[PDB]
UniProtKB/Swiss-Prot annotation, chains A, C, D, F:
Entry protein name: Lipoprotein PrgK
Whole sequence portion shown: 20 to 203 of 252
Organism phylogeny: Bacteria, Pseudomonadati, Pseudomonadota, Gammaproteobacteria, Enterobacterales
Family, as annotated: Belongs to the YscJ lipoprotein family.
Chief place where the protein resides: membrane
General function of this protein: Required for invasion of epithelial cells. Could be involved in protein secretion.
GO terms, biological process: protein secretion
Swiss-Prot record, chains B, E, G, H:
Covered range of the whole protein: 171 to 364 of 392
Disulfide cysteine pairs (residue numbers): none
Gene from which this protein is expressed: prgH
Described purpose of this protein according to its UniProt entry: Required for invasion of epithelial cells.
Organism whose genome encodes this protein: Salmonella typhimurium (strain LT2 / SGSC1412 / ATCC 700720)
Compartments reported by the entry: Cell membrane
Name of this chain's protein: Protein PrgH
Coiled-coil annotated residue ranges, if any: none
Keywords in alphabetical order: Cell membrane, Membrane, Transmembrane, Transmembrane helix, Virulence
GO terms for cellular component: plasma membrane
Length: 184, 194, 184, 184, 194, 184, 194, 194
């Protein structure tokens, strides 16, 4: 019994555990009520645990979204500040929708953010798209990359298939074995 | 309990195979019920040792083996429709092995698969392999381009494809990749524009 | 008995359970009153449970809609802020309506959002549409893709059939077996 | 006895039950007074129930109408905000009226929303219409599609028969058998 | 209870078939009442083992089998109008199998289906298969385009179709796909504009 | 028993320990409640510990982000101050997304910050990108550098492959041995 | 406890090898379960001494050794599909060593690997090594450029590649680098533009 | 305690060598576990005197010695793959020393290294030293420039290099500098632009 991380969120606790239990060390999530969770590993496993905290940069930051920097708390917002909150909402919605495809487990979608459509007289430049996707195993993984480029194309103003970069991959091998208590 | 009852409630998606190597083998059907059966054998509620073999994983497990001890071997796929007697498709026109060495190959693939009783190596034509992939590809009305090679053929399907020709393709490719594998003919569904 | 996730919504609880029960681990939804639900799995199944929480990125975010970023709480709104709340309401209504088709179970519809119709003198560019659809089994699944492209075409200003990308798929195989309690 | 969904509306309760009872699992609507309804299924039927909650995306959202985003609570409204509340009221009224036709059981009607009639000097573009309709069985189902295109044509400014897309279908087979209690 | 009463209250949509392999088979009619009958057999209120066989799933279950042990076989569909004696439609003009091997094929499809008493392989013309798909397609007044191949024919129906010609098509295609299958003639209802 | 550092954050404590335990000295994290953590090493190991504190410049500064200098606390912000808070949010989101690739453990992404798009009449110059990535061992480490240059290209306005500098590396060898108590 | 039980719950990803040098060797499969098995042997719950040998690390451990005591040796890779009898691929056309010195090489690689019973040095052609890397590279429809040298060949693949040709490449390169190593043919997937 | 247990928990990264000069020598592998083993010997938990010798530091420790008592000596590197019998690579074509003075050189390098039993001075060609550095450098597809000298050769690699050619270079240079040292051929990866 020796602590690693306390005061963690519900997001951060189940992801630090899922790291350590992948690397054959058993974590013990202790709840502390109003303070947040706390993760304690065993004392022989403490050295390897603090290595993978440094290596995977745990505890994770909350998922940075672009609308979190341009909030609705401001009563007045610049026209750049509502295009960047619009484009933030679209790419959140596309990655909510790619996860509802067949085979896809996770998705992260990025938009080329136009800023100066009305600042210099230049017309709006072409929109660029980039998507990740994590698949189940056994997928014909070179063939779903044409569905997503078809789907992401007709979801925007004028994009080309050279402007959509889908970088997808199969998931890791399933962690199903329990780690195992160190005998002392 | 015995493993025919430790699995799900209805028992025919899981074909339990008595092995050879002091072990018992579970023939899962698709990728998802592999994760159903592997969860039983990993939580630890079955006392003996047991594996979950898949039709898709035991193809690419022997292909790790067969890319080492028998390189430059032109073959297609092992079929596990009957997992006790699987069928190893071999190319008829691209091998020089006579039937002196084919039972040497079958009795060594039998040693890889303790569930298998005998591995039926049958030889089929590579002309029909690219024939069934082209007669089926024109039947889906797909604009393609054949690129013949030795030991391979590519059906490049480019162009600004609409919605139904991406869907008729992936229904055909996945119904083809299950049968003939992806070792002779590759389908390159790349999607350009004008 | 060991907890995974607590403080969950009614949306998020029935979707984390539906993930775990698909992967042969039995979840136990415990209600906590004003705090929200809580999902506890067994102690041998805890390792595999926290893997699929990481893999499927559970608990799910609530469904991001575009009108949630441009609310009616603001007493004054820019003309861009009511076109993006208009187009948000249309694509919510189209996916409420595709679910009422025959065979369709789920639907996600996206609109190309025009922003600068009045900002540069450029006329409004062509509207692009993209729809997902999840079908029952046994459907003639290549033939419903022409109904939806017919239906989505005459629901907007001037779209073409090259601007509507319907990416539909059959549903997964039905999970009907109970998972099964780990004996210890 | 094990709960699935509580705090539901009267709309949402009779539609989650109508899903589950279609799939041979008997739901039990328990009222909770001021909290809303609650649906509990049996414990052997709990696994299949939480699958169809995920699959059909239950509990349903309330029916998104376009006038719900542009309410009458605002004392001043832009001229775009009362055309979109006008066109919302028309398409609600058309689908109240198609349901009063012979054979039609349900209807969803969509309008092409013109936004920039007064923003660029462009004249108003052509109005596009799209209707669903769910019929009783035994209908001559290819022949009612000309009544609705006749009816929807002369209800607007200048539409063509190429701009009205009626996608209609017969209803599902009638669920009349009771599901059946699981014996234990 | 016995399974004729564990199902729904009215009993003729479910044709309970006594099997061969120590098992009992339920012949569901369409896709939805398969999920009615599979729910009974998965909650666990029937003590014996039992399957739910479908007319649409047992076609594409044997077609997994028949794409392996009998490749390059030109056939159409198994019909389960009488599930105890199903009818396997086979192409008359595109096979070289004589009746020496057809009872070899029938006695092996009988081994796949323990509910089946005998599988009646009948041979029909592929000219009427594309004839019934063309005489019916002109009768719906659909503007099409025939693309003949060997082992297949495509009736491409493109163009800016209006409302009733998408609806007359899908009523005809689905009433055709049930009968002749989708292995000889493919209907490509693609929808372009001008 | 002799102290090194007290009053440390949860971030800083697990990273000073992960340094010292890599260099064969066993650190002992002592919590002090509201004051923060405290790290005490043994008295023979005190000399080598204070050397690696100086050498690795421990305790670490918190991760400087560009939006921390341009906060949302100001009620009015210059148009330069919301482009630099926009570009800060994008590069936080890209490095949240590269960590979700296969093989990548850590990522730091930098953007060329344009400042004077509207200050001199000069058009916006080309955007430059630079990414770090720390991989698992056994990776084909020269081949993932083309995925990231593909992914980072179509996430911005107009970049070239000469403007994206991906400098990636494998991780260090795993620290799994416990350090060991000095016997006295 | 004995080390077959101190590892994970299911035991076939870990092939425990009895050694020669008073030691016991664990043959992990990929990189991640090396870190599973090294965690057991480093927390200190196994009383004897034990290593975790990898197929990828014991290739580049002997290549440290073999770059010193046998320089200018043209070889490919050791395969650990059977770790008790590994297979050391050697180039047939670029060595001058006769079979007088090959058992001198095998009995010294046997001294490096105490788990190995005998190291089977087999000689294969370098023409097929660049043949299997080119027949496979045209089959992925990749625009490449061959640069022949002695003791090596480079398949430079430049250009503004789209999404699927970066993905078909890395699936092929990684399925090639596992087999033939990266000592004869280098794949240079560099990504320019126009 | 004895020093085989005062080090880390798993003992094969540290090769403890019995010395000659009343002392015991620890052969660390890389730079980081030198700092692991030097920390043991500096906190003072081992009663005898002991050093930590490195493959990289004992090369540049003798090169301090060998630049004084044997100047103008053309050599490459000492290899410590077997630290009890290290191998001192010497240039064959750039020395005038016969084998009268080479055992004079070996018995004086043996006096520098009390862990070494005998130092095997072997002579290798400098043509292959610049050959292995050029055949490997073209195989990485790097645009270089050879500058021949006597007693040295420079492979200047300038130009606006992209990302993968800085990474393929540093993987090759570091895998070359470990073997042949940096005393004959220098790699000048300088990075200009246009």
């Amino acid at each position: 019994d020796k602590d690693l991380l306390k005061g963690l969120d519900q997001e951060q606790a189940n992801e630090v555990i899922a790291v350590l239990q992948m690397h054959n060390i058993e974590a013990n999530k202790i709840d502390s009520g109003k303070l947040g969770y706390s993760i304690t590993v065993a004392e022989p496993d403490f050295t390897a645990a603090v290595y993978w905290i440094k290596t995977y940069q745990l505890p994770p930051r909350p998922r940075v979204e672009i609308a979190q920097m341009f909030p609705a708390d401001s009563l007045v917002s610049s026209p750049r500040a509502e295009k960047a909150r619009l484009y933030s909402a679209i790419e959140q919605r596309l990655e909510q929708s790619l996860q509802t495809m067949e085979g896809v487990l996770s998705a992260r979608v990025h938009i080329s953010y136009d800023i100066d459509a009305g600042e210099n007289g230049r017309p709006p430049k072409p929109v660029h798209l980039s998507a990740l996707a994590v698949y189940e195993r056994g997928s014909p993984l070179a063939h779903q990359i044409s569905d997503i480029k078809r789907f992401l194309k007709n979801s925007f103003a004028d994009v080309d298939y050279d402007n959509i970069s889908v970088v997808l991959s199969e998931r890791s091998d399933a962690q199903l074995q329990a780690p195992g208590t160190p005998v002392k | 309990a015995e493993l025919d009852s430790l699995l799900g409630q209805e028992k025919e998606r899981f074909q339990v195979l008595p092995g050879r190597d002091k072990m018992l083998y579970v023939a899962a059907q698709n990728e998802r019920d592999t994760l159903w059966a592997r969860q039983v054998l990993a939580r630890g509620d079955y006392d003996k040792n047991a594996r979950v073999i898949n039709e898709n994983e035991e193809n690419k497990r022997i292909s790790i083996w067969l890319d080492t001890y028998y390189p430059q071997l032109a073959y297609y796929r092992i079929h596990f429709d009957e997992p006790r007697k699987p069928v190893f498709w071999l190319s008829r026109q691209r091998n020089t092995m006579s039937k002196k060495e084919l039972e040497v190959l079958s009795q060594k693939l039998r040693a890889l698969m303790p569930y298998a009783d005998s591995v039926n190596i049958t030889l089929m034509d590579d002309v029909t392999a690219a024939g069934q992939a082209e007669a089926g590809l024109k039947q889906q009305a797909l604009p393609y381009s054949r690129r013949n090679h030795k030991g391979g053929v590519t059906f490049v399907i480019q162009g600004a494809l609409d919605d139904v020709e991406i869907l008729r393709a992936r229904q055909f490719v996945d119904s083809y990749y299950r049968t003939w594998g992806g070792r002779y003919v590759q389908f390159a569904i790349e999607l350009k524009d004008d």
